[PDB]
Amino acid sequence: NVNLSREKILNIFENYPIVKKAYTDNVPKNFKEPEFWARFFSSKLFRKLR
Amino acid sequence: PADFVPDSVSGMFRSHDFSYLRLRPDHASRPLWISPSDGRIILESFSPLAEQAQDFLVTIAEPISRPSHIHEYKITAYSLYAAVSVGLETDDIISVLDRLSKVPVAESIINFIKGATISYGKVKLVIKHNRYFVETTQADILQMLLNDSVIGVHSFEIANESVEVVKKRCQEIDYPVLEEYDFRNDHRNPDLDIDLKPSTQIRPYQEKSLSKMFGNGRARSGIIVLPCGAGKTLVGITAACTIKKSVIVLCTSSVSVMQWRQQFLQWCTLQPENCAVFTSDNKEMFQTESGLVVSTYSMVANTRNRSHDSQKVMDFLTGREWGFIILDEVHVVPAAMFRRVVSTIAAHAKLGLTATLVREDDKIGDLNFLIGPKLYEANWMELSQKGHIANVQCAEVWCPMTAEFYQEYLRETARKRMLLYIMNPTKFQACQFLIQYHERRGDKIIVFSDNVYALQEYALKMGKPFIYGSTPQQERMNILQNFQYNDQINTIFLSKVGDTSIDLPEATCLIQISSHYGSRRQEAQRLGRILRAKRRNDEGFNAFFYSLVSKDTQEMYYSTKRQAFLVDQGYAFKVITHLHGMENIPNLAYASPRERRELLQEVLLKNHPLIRKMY
Amino acid sequence: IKMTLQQIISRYKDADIYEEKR
Amino acid sequence: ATLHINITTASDEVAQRELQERQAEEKRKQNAVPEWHKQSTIGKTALGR
Amino acid sequence: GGYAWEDEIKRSWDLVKVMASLVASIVEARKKRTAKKNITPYQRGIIRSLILTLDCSEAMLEKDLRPNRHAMIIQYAIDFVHEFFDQNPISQMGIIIMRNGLAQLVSQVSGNPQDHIDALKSIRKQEPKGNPSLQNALEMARGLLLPVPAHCTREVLIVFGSLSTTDPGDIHQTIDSLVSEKIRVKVLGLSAQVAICKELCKATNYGDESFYKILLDETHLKELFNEAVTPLPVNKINKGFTLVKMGFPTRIFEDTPTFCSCHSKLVYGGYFCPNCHSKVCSLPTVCPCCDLMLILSTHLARSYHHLMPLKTFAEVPTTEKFRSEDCFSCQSRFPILKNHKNGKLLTSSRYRCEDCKQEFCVDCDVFIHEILHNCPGCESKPV
Ligand SMILES: [Zn+2]
Ligand SMILES: [Zn+2]
Ligand SMILES: [Zn+2]
Ligand SMILES: [Zn+2]
């Protein structure tokens, strides 16, 4: 398990605009936000950005 | 005396008034007081130049007791032998003692240092071709000894079994025997490539003990005492790696033999084909020119008709000149024919490793004749305050004996009195309350009681597993695994099986329901099972020792006799005559008078081929 | 199939829990 | 194996810190010295039923 | 190829090898007196608005200062608040803490030290954590010092403990804004000399690099905290010499409780405002009804000793003929002070004053300069 603070989400968006860009076109459109972050932490994009 | 008139208050000092020693003007800097009557040294630790004196005193003197403020040391002959063995000349010791003492050093103490330090290293026991020799660099020292002539540059061979008699006799004379192994210059014995693994770290007190052993560049035979969990096994491995010769290790249990083999294979670069085990199941020897054998005292010292293969292995051990012997749990060496293992094995260096250097008889002092002088006394409170061992809170719960049990206790024999004071119901209630309280605290509790019937009765009353001698070994292993891992199993009852060297899970609480008379060795052995807990790194962690004893009985006498050794180590046994919450506990063992009466009655009632079809 | 299905049903269980809590 | 997340709007995180403080208090209570060890029990009544 | 145990024993007792000690003490005493020779009546801003920035980040969790950094910084800040409002009564003060990347305001800029003491006591219980932000703290200090009048000096005291800081934006723009607003920042560092703090202290104090203070131990921390209660010497380029309109209220006496004009609570005593006749609770405070500074004569009286200081007392020569055998304002007899056998009257404990030529002992030397601020010999002189 990982704790995701709101300011952690804001700093993820600010430091990485790619995550906010993927957030804007998916979360209100296809799947909800916790599903989005569950998909993102299992993705190669997270490993590349880390 | 120094032309000093005695004071009016000198009456109650039985020739111990040392006021004639004129105090030095700069006394407040000096930390020492020297008693001319017995050589006792009084060291104050709070003063400046204390540790710079404390190392000097622990090199030259035996510490009788080491409390927080004032430390007490004894100048004895063996401590002086150890002091001169590491290169301290007599004049240096006298001058440093004179500089560090407030009162001037009396001429009695100076003459004692002169007498004990001189005539050292005259007689030496050397081993040549598995055959003992006593050697002296001076010719007439051989001729002056004529009382115990067991004769078989100037030297004469003595018998193998008479080495202890020769050492005792030469200690009675003013020529003590020098037992030191110069393994650097010993090329007859084949060496070993054994060395410590680089990943193994050695704590500074272990380094200090080994520096006591290897101070002069030669292995000195002696005894190193360390608490349980302080790493006496690691000290044994490290000494074996230092000597780099053939090593024989004697243990008290077969599980200890397997543990020692595992520690040799783990902590140092010893190949398994160089190691061997002499037990009942395992009897094959290493085929190399040098290596390790680990065995049991009873196996080596078996006077019974041993098997043919065991006879062959014992012949191999006796015919080989060993460079090092490790006598783990050396307190059992002074026994009847456990004494003979130092004579049946021709070993150059003899190290005794123990945690309980006490016996209830006077034979504990014979170890200096058997193994050697006490090389290193570990300060248990220094190790506890540095986190090396657990900081136990020793206590002594006083259980008031009930009226009917005490009435039956007075009019009984001692053997029945024993069981009758063990099974008092107030001790049941106190143990149950302590188990409940320390199980709520999440502590692993090991309950010790030597009486098997009492062990079973307490375990059945409290619903906790019990381990003793006739329990099967697989059941014992299963119960130990459940105690180590299952969170519902936090209390296991143990008999005298747990006192001896067997493998146990880590425990942080201990309750001693009963005991074996005034065995100080058993009392300190039980304390060692909670001294090595994993939670030592946690700040504020304390382990707990409880000695539940019945009031106004011989159990007070035996408990005080047992705790004498632990308070000699420095532990403070705080009595507990009241437990807060005894009446508020839900279920009390034998609260009703009828239940106590039933328990009383139960305790009282405890005490030609064809003719072969015939057979 | 079991790792893919376990991941997607874990995601859906987390989504259901977080919609229930909100 | 599986990954789980804790999405918060930074409002319940103070409550989570308070719960961690409560866990720390429980840890303090676990290592608490018993009352018969921190003070003498001589003046109190004798133990029994 | 050997081992550690096979080496020779350490012999630590042998390593210990064993009057002109008064001279060795008095040379250090004279060197300490040498650093105090530069006594001048520098103009100092008496009316101050000191913002106390306290670090409350993860660096306070270090226990290198007993028992932890945060607890004793809070205690030393409490003592500093007491000493600051004792020696600078007119001056106002605000307290800001840095925690979790956000500057936090814990007490408004007020002339009442009790509110700041209560705020510090409230902060003492919480555990410090987070990553400090010098820019957020400096921006909030800039916002708090914005309504400060031009006559009142704007100062910021930072008890900074971390070695690195994270800023939401550029910190040099904040430094330039602080310089433009005439705000002097003094930073008390804890671990080492941070370059941004040194640059900030150098820029905000007109090229002075002596306002970045780093402690050494407990006593140095206490000395550095006690160094900040003195008003800073202002620059010659500052031309904000303005008259300050203020009133001296009369202490009203009444057994009947009345509503105060500052907190709207029943108060027995008080001070009626000399301009608008509205009672106040404590002094010195601005008037809640007419915005006038209400102080006492004692509040002004505390600060002349900064305006003119006492010249430091001169150690008398040993060969000089002493005027008196005992102290002047103390009449303690000066001893022989034979430091060695032929020392005779070496380093005689008399301390001549530069004006009255009167001799004083060491206790009078450290009392007349510290607790008193006036020479009894200079006042006994019949000019
Ligand atoms: Zn008010
Ligand atoms: Zn007014
Ligand atoms: Zn004076
Ligand atoms: Zn003067």
Short mmCIF file of N, CA and C in Angstrom, two decimals, chain B residues 450-528:
data_model
loop_
_atom_site.label_atom_id
_atom_site.label_comp_id
_atom_site.label_asym_id
_atom_site.label_seq_id
_atom_site.Cartn_x
_atom_site.Cartn_y
_atom_site.Cartn_z
N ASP B 450 11.82 -27.03 38.34
CA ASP B 450 12.54 -28.30 38.27
C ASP B 450 11.65 -29.48 38.64
N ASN B 451 10.64 -29.27 39.48
CA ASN B 451 9.72 -30.34 39.82
C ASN B 451 8.83 -30.64 38.63
N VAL B 452 8.90 -31.88 38.14
CA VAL B 452 8.15 -32.27 36.95
C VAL B 452 6.66 -32.28 37.23
N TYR B 453 6.25 -32.82 38.38
CA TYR B 453 4.84 -32.86 38.73
C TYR B 453 4.26 -31.46 38.88
N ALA B 454 5.02 -30.56 39.52
CA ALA B 454 4.59 -29.18 39.64
C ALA B 454 4.52 -28.50 38.28
N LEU B 455 5.48 -28.80 37.41
CA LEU B 455 5.48 -28.26 36.05
C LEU B 455 4.21 -28.65 35.31
N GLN B 456 3.87 -29.94 35.35
CA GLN B 456 2.67 -30.43 34.69
C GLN B 456 1.41 -29.83 35.30
N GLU B 457 1.36 -29.71 36.63
CA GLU B 457 0.17 -29.19 37.28
C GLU B 457 -0.04 -27.71 36.96
N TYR B 458 1.03 -26.92 37.00
CA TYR B 458 0.93 -25.51 36.64
C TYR B 458 0.53 -25.33 35.19
N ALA B 459 1.12 -26.13 34.29
CA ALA B 459 0.79 -26.03 32.88
C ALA B 459 -0.65 -26.42 32.60
N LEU B 460 -1.15 -27.47 33.26
CA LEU B 460 -2.53 -27.88 33.07
C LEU B 460 -3.50 -26.88 33.67
N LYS B 461 -3.13 -26.25 34.78
CA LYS B 461 -4.00 -25.25 35.38
C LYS B 461 -4.08 -23.99 34.53
N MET B 462 -2.95 -23.58 33.94
CA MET B 462 -2.89 -22.34 33.18
C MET B 462 -3.08 -22.54 31.68
N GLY B 463 -3.21 -23.78 31.23
CA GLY B 463 -3.45 -24.05 29.82
C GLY B 463 -2.31 -23.67 28.90
N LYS B 464 -1.07 -23.89 29.32
CA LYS B 464 0.10 -23.56 28.53
C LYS B 464 0.94 -24.81 28.30
N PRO B 465 1.64 -24.91 27.17
CA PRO B 465 2.43 -26.11 26.91
C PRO B 465 3.63 -26.23 27.83
N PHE B 466 4.01 -27.47 28.11
CA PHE B 466 5.14 -27.78 28.97
C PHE B 466 6.12 -28.70 28.26
N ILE B 467 7.40 -28.52 28.56
CA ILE B 467 8.48 -29.29 27.97
C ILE B 467 9.35 -29.82 29.10
N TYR B 468 9.59 -31.13 29.11
CA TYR B 468 10.50 -31.72 30.07
C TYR B 468 11.16 -32.94 29.44
N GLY B 469 11.77 -33.78 30.28
CA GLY B 469 12.72 -34.77 29.78
C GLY B 469 12.10 -35.86 28.92
N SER B 470 10.96 -36.40 29.33
CA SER B 470 10.39 -37.53 28.61
C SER B 470 9.48 -37.12 27.46
N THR B 471 9.31 -35.82 27.23
CA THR B 471 8.58 -35.38 26.05
C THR B 471 9.37 -35.73 24.80
N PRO B 472 8.70 -36.21 23.75
CA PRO B 472 9.41 -36.56 22.51
C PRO B 472 10.05 -35.35 21.86
N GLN B 473 11.18 -35.60 21.19
CA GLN B 473 11.99 -34.52 20.63
C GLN B 473 11.27 -33.79 19.51
N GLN B 474 10.47 -34.51 18.71
CA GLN B 474 9.67 -33.84 17.69
C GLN B 474 8.57 -32.98 18.31
N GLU B 475 7.97 -33.44 19.41
CA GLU B 475 7.00 -32.62 20.12
C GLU B 475 7.66 -31.40 20.74
N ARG B 476 8.87 -31.56 21.27
CA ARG B 476 9.62 -30.43 21.81
C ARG B 476 9.93 -29.41 20.73
N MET B 477 10.35 -29.88 19.55
CA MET B 477 10.62 -28.97 18.44
C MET B 477 9.35 -28.26 17.98
N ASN B 478 8.23 -28.98 17.91
CA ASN B 478 6.97 -28.36 17.50
C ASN B 478 6.52 -27.30 18.49
N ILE B 479 6.66 -27.58 19.79
CA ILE B 479 6.26 -26.62 20.81
C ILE B 479 7.18 -25.40 20.78
N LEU B 480 8.48 -25.62 20.54
CA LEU B 480 9.40 -24.49 20.42
C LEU B 480 9.09 -23.63 19.20
N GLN B 481 8.74 -24.26 18.07
CA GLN B 481 8.37 -23.49 16.89
C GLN B 481 7.08 -22.71 17.12
N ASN B 482 6.11 -23.32 17.81
CA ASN B 482 4.87 -22.62 18.14
C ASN B 482 5.13 -21.44 19.07
N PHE B 483 6.03 -21.62 20.04
CA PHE B 483 6.40 -20.53 20.93
C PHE B 483 7.10 -19.41 20.18
N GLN B 484 7.93 -19.76 19.21
CA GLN B 484 8.67 -18.75 18.47
C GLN B 484 7.79 -18.00 17.47
N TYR B 485 6.78 -18.66 16.91
CA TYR B 485 6.04 -18.04 15.81
C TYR B 485 4.57 -17.82 16.09
N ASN B 486 3.88 -18.76 16.73
CA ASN B 486 2.45 -18.59 16.96
C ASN B 486 2.21 -17.55 18.04
N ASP B 487 1.40 -16.54 17.73
CA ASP B 487 1.14 -15.46 18.67
C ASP B 487 0.24 -15.90 19.81
N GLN B 488 -0.51 -16.98 19.65
CA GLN B 488 -1.30 -17.52 20.74
C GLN B 488 -0.47 -18.32 21.73
N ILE B 489 0.76 -18.68 21.37
CA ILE B 489 1.65 -19.40 22.26
C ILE B 489 2.74 -18.46 22.73
N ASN B 490 2.53 -17.83 23.89
CA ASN B 490 3.49 -16.90 24.45
C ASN B 490 4.09 -17.37 25.76
N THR B 491 3.66 -18.52 26.28
CA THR B 491 4.19 -19.06 27.52
C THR B 491 4.39 -20.56 27.37
N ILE B 492 5.63 -21.01 27.57
CA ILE B 492 5.95 -22.43 27.59
C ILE B 492 6.60 -22.75 28.93
N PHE B 493 6.15 -23.82 29.57
CA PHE B 493 6.70 -24.27 30.83
C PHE B 493 7.88 -25.19 30.57
N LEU B 494 8.98 -24.98 31.28
CA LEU B 494 10.19 -25.77 31.07
C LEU B 494 10.71 -26.31 32.39
N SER B 495 11.16 -27.55 32.36
CA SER B 495 11.85 -28.18 33.48
C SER B 495 13.34 -27.90 33.34
N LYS B 496 14.17 -28.68 34.04
CA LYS B 496 15.63 -28.55 34.00
C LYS B 496 16.22 -28.79 32.61
N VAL B 497 15.41 -29.25 31.64
CA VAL B 497 15.85 -29.34 30.25
C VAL B 497 16.25 -27.97 29.73
N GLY B 498 15.50 -26.93 30.08
CA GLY B 498 15.82 -25.60 29.62
C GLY B 498 17.03 -24.98 30.29
N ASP B 499 17.40 -25.47 31.48
CA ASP B 499 18.57 -24.94 32.16
C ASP B 499 19.85 -25.27 31.40
N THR B 500 19.99 -26.50 30.93
CA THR B 500 21.19 -26.90 30.21
C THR B 500 21.16 -26.34 28.79
N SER B 501 22.27 -26.55 28.08
CA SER B 501 22.49 -25.92 26.78
C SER B 501 21.64 -26.62 25.72
N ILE B 502 20.41 -26.14 25.55
CA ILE B 502 19.56 -26.51 24.43
C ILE B 502 19.13 -25.23 23.73
N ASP B 503 18.69 -25.37 22.49
CA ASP B 503 18.26 -24.23 21.70
C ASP B 503 16.87 -23.78 22.14
N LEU B 504 16.72 -22.48 22.38
CA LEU B 504 15.45 -21.92 22.81
C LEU B 504 15.12 -20.68 22.00
N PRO B 505 13.84 -20.40 21.79
CA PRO B 505 13.45 -19.12 21.20
C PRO B 505 13.70 -17.98 22.17
N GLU B 506 13.76 -16.77 21.62
CA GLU B 506 14.05 -15.60 22.43
C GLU B 506 12.85 -15.25 23.31
N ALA B 507 13.11 -15.04 24.60
CA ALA B 507 12.08 -14.73 25.57
C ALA B 507 12.45 -13.45 26.31
N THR B 508 11.43 -12.71 26.72
CA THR B 508 11.64 -11.44 27.42
C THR B 508 11.09 -11.44 28.83
N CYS B 509 10.48 -12.53 29.29
CA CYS B 509 10.01 -12.65 30.66
C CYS B 509 10.31 -14.05 31.15
N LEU B 510 10.55 -14.17 32.46
CA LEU B 510 10.87 -15.46 33.04
C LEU B 510 10.28 -15.56 34.43
N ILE B 511 9.69 -16.72 34.73
CA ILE B 511 9.14 -17.02 36.04
C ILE B 511 9.76 -18.32 36.52
N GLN B 512 10.33 -18.30 37.72
CA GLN B 512 10.97 -19.48 38.30
C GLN B 512 10.08 -20.00 39.42
N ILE B 513 9.24 -20.98 39.10
CA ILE B 513 8.32 -21.54 40.09
C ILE B 513 9.08 -22.33 41.15
N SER B 514 10.00 -23.20 40.72
CA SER B 514 10.79 -23.99 41.64
C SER B 514 12.23 -24.03 41.15
N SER B 515 13.10 -24.64 41.94
CA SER B 515 14.53 -24.61 41.67
C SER B 515 15.18 -25.83 42.30
N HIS B 516 16.43 -26.07 41.91
CA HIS B 516 17.20 -27.20 42.42
C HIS B 516 18.12 -26.69 43.52
N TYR B 517 17.59 -26.63 44.74
CA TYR B 517 18.30 -26.26 45.97
C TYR B 517 18.87 -24.85 45.80
N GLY B 518 20.14 -24.62 46.10
CA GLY B 518 20.76 -23.32 45.95
C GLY B 518 21.75 -23.28 44.81
N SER B 519 21.39 -23.88 43.68
CA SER B 519 22.27 -23.94 42.52
C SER B 519 22.40 -22.56 41.91
N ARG B 520 23.54 -21.91 42.16
CA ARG B 520 23.81 -20.62 41.55
C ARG B 520 24.05 -20.75 40.05
N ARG B 521 24.64 -21.87 39.63
CA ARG B 521 24.86 -22.13 38.21
C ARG B 521 23.54 -22.21 37.46
N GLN B 522 22.57 -22.93 38.01
CA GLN B 522 21.26 -23.04 37.36
C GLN B 522 20.53 -21.71 37.36
N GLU B 523 20.65 -20.94 38.45
CA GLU B 523 20.00 -19.64 38.53
C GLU B 523 20.56 -18.68 37.49
N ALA B 524 21.88 -18.67 37.30
CA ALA B 524 22.45 -17.80 36.28
C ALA B 524 22.24 -18.35 34.87
N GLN B 525 22.10 -19.68 34.73
CA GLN B 525 21.81 -20.26 33.43
C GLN B 525 20.40 -19.92 32.98
N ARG B 526 19.45 -19.89 33.91
CA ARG B 526 18.09 -19.51 33.57
C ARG B 526 18.01 -18.04 33.18
N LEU B 527 18.78 -17.19 33.87
CA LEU B 527 18.81 -15.77 33.52
C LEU B 527 19.39 -15.55 32.13
N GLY B 528 20.30 -16.42 31.69
CA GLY B 528 20.90 -16.28 30.38
C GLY B 528 19.97 -16.54 29.22
#
